[PDB]
Structure 1
Amino acid sequence: LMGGFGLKHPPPQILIKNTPVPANPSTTFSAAKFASFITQYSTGQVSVEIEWELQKENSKRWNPEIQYTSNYNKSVNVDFTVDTNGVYSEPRPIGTRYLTRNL
Structure 2
Amino acid sequence: QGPIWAKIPHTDGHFHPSPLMGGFGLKHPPPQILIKNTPVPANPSTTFSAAKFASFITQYS
Scaled to the shorter chain, the TM-score interval is 0.5 to 0.7
Counterpart of 1:19, as a letter, is T
Unaligned runs of 5+ in 1: 43-103
Superposition CA RMSD, Å: 0.4
State the match for 2:25 in structure 1: 6
Percent same amino acid at aligned positions? 100
Match of 2:47 in 1: 28
**Greater Rg by CA:** 1
Can you give the 5+ residue segments of structure 2 that lack an aligned partner in the other structure? Answer: 1-19
Shift, 1:38, TM fit: 0.3
Q: How many corresponding residue pairs?
A: 42
Larger strand proportion, structure 1 or 2? 2
TM-score (norm 2): 0.67
> With structure 1 as the length reference, what TM-score do the two structures score?
0.40
Higher relative contact order (CA 8 A, sep 6+): 2
